[PDB]
Design an enzyme around this catalytic site. Structure first.
Site, PDB file in Angstrom:
ATOM      1  N   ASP A 336      33.135   9.678  29.211  1.00  0.00           N
ATOM      2  CA  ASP A 336      33.856   8.438  28.987  1.00  0.00           C
ATOM      3  C   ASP A 336      35.131   8.359  29.826  1.00  0.00           C
ATOM      4  O   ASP A 336      35.932   9.295  29.859  1.00  0.00           O
ATOM      5  CB  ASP A 336      34.203   8.316  27.515  1.00  0.00           C
ATOM      6  CG  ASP A 336      34.791   6.979  27.176  1.00  0.00           C
ATOM      7  OD1 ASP A 336      34.039   5.984  27.196  1.00  0.00           O
ATOM      8  OD2 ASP A 336      36.009   6.918  26.909  1.00  0.00           O
ATOM      9  N   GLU A 370      32.112   7.104  33.192  1.00  0.00           N
ATOM     10  CA  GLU A 370      32.776   5.833  33.522  1.00  0.00           C
ATOM     11  C   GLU A 370      33.998   5.999  34.418  1.00  0.00           C
ATOM     12  O   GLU A 370      34.952   6.679  34.022  1.00  0.00           O
ATOM     13  CB  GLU A 370      33.186   5.097  32.259  1.00  0.00           C
ATOM     14  CG  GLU A 370      32.086   4.928  31.243  1.00  0.00           C
ATOM     15  CD  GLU A 370      32.588   4.304  29.960  1.00  0.00           C
ATOM     16  OE1 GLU A 370      33.425   3.381  30.041  1.00  0.00           O
ATOM     17  OE2 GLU A 370      32.148   4.732  28.873  1.00  0.00           O
TER      18      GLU A 370
END
Length: 717
Positions: A336, A370
């Site tokens: 993430d 990400e």
């Protein structure tokens, strides 16, 4: 830059956390600013269970030049629980353990796992399921509960929602012992051959109460990390018990490894659930970036950024990601919001994996995340798409510029390409190259259309096509999801897929579904029958991909393109191998209605997908330099002169025939696991287990390599 003194030194310390041996155990922890770090022990994951007593307290001893605090004690502390009290600036805060390999309930505490003892039967001869190329994955993102918990899921009422739902031998739609040809749960993964799972975050996260059953009111995606190094308890049958979660995880891992399915783990280092996490409790103001000693920055979410820049975090990541790969045999890590981390930390984790295993196999472990930030990033060096050339070639990034062009916004009705927005087509066609941003290897670009976050692909498809939640059977909209799979699974770089996109999993239009009811967040497996063909079409593409190196090469190949604009994108892969189809052409029609004739890469083709069905068996030949992409159809063509080179056998599944008998014969249950020809027929007692007397010796063969069309019997229970 709080304490790089005492963190250049101390960087090479070892045995941080706790280390187990039968005679004695050693604890080491780093807090140069502390006046004291005190070890404290407990006997349980929480005060819920019986006894739960603390055991005692012990002052650790600081090493000045490193500042590291260490302690060693004799005696067997196996499965004892413990915590540190950290004393900094005269405050004291209880820290769980910064390095927590095994945890109590929600993480409140840690216990000294006798690591290898947890291993399930037939674990020591487990193997990783690495992919030689990174791209050969086909990541099926499942949040475990979603796959398991539907009433119709076939999964047993005690495996419903839990890791062993990947392990329950054999299961059919609505559980009926029947020609209920919809096998569900783990069986479906074998039928699809989904090749690689990604578990949505299976480390311990705080946003579900593990004390009570997971439910429409006790759900989260789990982006609230609390312990990085211990798996979630709530998905255990027995969260109160370490090892259990570990073993089941190992059994879930082993069931996927047995079936030759790689397991990739979403790990969320960029932020933590709480500004009073152990980190701040252990070195207050080191681990979290702070624009002022008064105020955290918020460049991610939830009010914090991990101090990735700062050494004694860089280490913690490096020797955590290794830990999961060391023990659980996790085959890759999805980060993430990498953009919060400094690249000079991602580069070390990557480089640290490359040396875990002496044969360098660790080089094969996938890593990506990400690249965007979640706010005003507090420091200038960030894992961005623009800085991407400074990451190691084998750390990857999601490619939003690609995503949005396929489908539109994550959230609005605004139509993307798939729904007919021609003006994204140019950006999607570039995304298929994999270089949606400057990237060095296909290992980087996580070509993806969809995630847990915002509209699940179907919900946008229906919402963008203009109506809500419809559960529609429309051959248009149901034909429209097959566009995405036609793209993603044929892009270069790691294809990605929210679990059950392939049967039009719906969340009824819910965007930030992160805690939405089970009725919103469950796989209703009756959609697998209703949205059959879609999954059959989806399976058929993995047959195409896994047998086709160019779609899965480790370095970049590059499609040619024959249309990139308007409502048809069309591109062709090239190959030189003799045991594979040769050239492949993929065409995705953005129209919902029109049937454009497309020019194609070569003078002879065999149709292997038609928007209804797909996979190795010829669905039709076609000849001459053109092909028609009817309406929503995503179609695959392979160069017809070399279609035969793919001489794979049929996936001749074998079977277990569990016939549980307590006494006097008869039948208590009859599953029939549909294992692939390899793998192993491992099998388990999980029926008469809540409280019961109906129990049997479990005479039978019980385990071994499966063998094709053969029935392996165990008389469990």
């Amino acid at each position: 830059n709080y304490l790089e003194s005492y963190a250049s030194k101390a960087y090479n310390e070892s045995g941080l956390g706790s280390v187990y041996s039968k005679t004695s155990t050693t604890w080491k922890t780093w807090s140069p600013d502390a006046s004291s770090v005190k070890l404290k022990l407990y006997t349980t994951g929480s005060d819920n269970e019986a006894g739960a007593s603390a055991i005692g307290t012990y002052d650790m001893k600081k090493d000045s030049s490193t500042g590291v605090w260490s302690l060693n004690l004799s005696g067997d502390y196996k499965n004892k629980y413990y915590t540190y009290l950290v004393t900094v600036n005269g405050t004291t805060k209880e820290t769980q353990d910064v390095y927590s390999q095994a945890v109590g309930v929600n993480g409140n505490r840690t216990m000294v796992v006798d690591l290898d003892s947890t291993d399930p039967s037939g674990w020591s001869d487990d193997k990783h399921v690495l992919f030689n190329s990174a791209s050969e994955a086909a990541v099926w993102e499942v949040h475990v509960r979603d796959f398991s918990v539907s009433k119709n899921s076939g999964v047993s009422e005690d495996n419903k929602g839990k890791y062993l739902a990947f392990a329950e031998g054999g299961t059919t739609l609505n559980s009926d012992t029947s020609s209920s040809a919809v096998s569900t749960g783990i069986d479906y993964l074998v039928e699809q051959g989904i090749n690689c799972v990604q578990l949505m975050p299976v480390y311990d996260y705080g946003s579900v109460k593990e004390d009570v059953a997971s439910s429409s009111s006790n759900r989260n995606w789990g982006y609230d990390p609390v312990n990085y190094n211990a798996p979630e308890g709530s998905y255990s049958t027995n969260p109160y018990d370490g090892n259990t979660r570990i073993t089941e995880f190992k059994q879930m891992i082993q069931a996927l490894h047995d079936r030759g399915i790689s397991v990739v783990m979403d790990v969320v280092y960029n932020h933590t659930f709480s500004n009073d996490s152990c980190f701040n409790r252990t070195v207050p103001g080191y681990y979290y970036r702070m624009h002022s000693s008064s105020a955290y920055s918020n460049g991610s979410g939830c009010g914090n950024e991990t101090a990735s820049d700062k050494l004694m975090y860089r280490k913690y990541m490096i020797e955590s990601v290794k830990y999961w790969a060391e023990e659980y045999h996790i085959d890759g890590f999805r980060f993430d919001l990498m953009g919060i981390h400094d690249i000079t930390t991602m580069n070390d984790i990557r480089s640290a994996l490359d040396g875990l295993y002496s044969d360098g196999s660790g080089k094969k472990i996938l890593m990506y995340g990400e690249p965007w930030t979640g706010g005003s990033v507090a420091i200038s060096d960030g894992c961005s798409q623009s800085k991407a050339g400074s990451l190691n070639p084998r750390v990857g990034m999601f490619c939003d510029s690609y995503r949005d062009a396929i489908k539109g916004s994550t959230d609005g009705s605004d139509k993307g390409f798939v729904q007919g927005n021609t003006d994204k087509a140019g950006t999607v066609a570039n995304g298929v190259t994999g270089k949606g941003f400057s990237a060095q290897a296909p290992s980087q670009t996580i070509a993806y259309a969809d995630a847990h976050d915002n509209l699940i692909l179907w919900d946008k498809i229906v919402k963008s096509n203009g109506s809500s939640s419809w559960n529609s059977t429309s051959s248009s909209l149901r034909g429209q999801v097959k566009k995405v799979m036609g793209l993603l699974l044929t892009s270069q770089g790691i294809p990605f897929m929210t679990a059950g996109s392939e049967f039009c999993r719906t969340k009824q239009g819910d965007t930030n579904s992160y805690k939405s009811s089970d009725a919103i967040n469950e796989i209703d497996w009756s959609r697998v029958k209703t949205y059959s063909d879609v999954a059959a079409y989806y399976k058929g593409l993995l047959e195409i991909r896994e047998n086709y190196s160019p779609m899965k090469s480790s370095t970049f190949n590059t499609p040619s393109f024959q249309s990139t604009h308007g409502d048809v994108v069309a591109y062709t892969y090239s190959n030189n191998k003799s045991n594979e189809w040769g050239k492949v052409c993929v065409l995705v029609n953005a129209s919902s209605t029109n049937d454009w004739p497309i020019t194609l890469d070569g003078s002879g083709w065999t149709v292997v997908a038609d928007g209804t069905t797909a996979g190795l068996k010829s669905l039709g030949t076609v000849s001459g330099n053109t092909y028609t992409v009817p309406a929503n159809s995503a179609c695959v063509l392979v160069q017809s002169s070399t279609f035969n080179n793919l001489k794979v056998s049929e996936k001749t599944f074998g079977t277990v025939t569990i016939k549980h008998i307590d006494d006097s014969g008869n039948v208590l249950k009859t599953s029939t696991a549909k294992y692939a020809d390899g793998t192993t027929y491992r099998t388990y007692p999980d029926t008469t287990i809540l409280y019961d007397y109906a129990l049997k010796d479990t005479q039978g063969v019980t385990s071994g390599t499966v063998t094709g069309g053969k029935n392996y019997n165990v008389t469990y229970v």
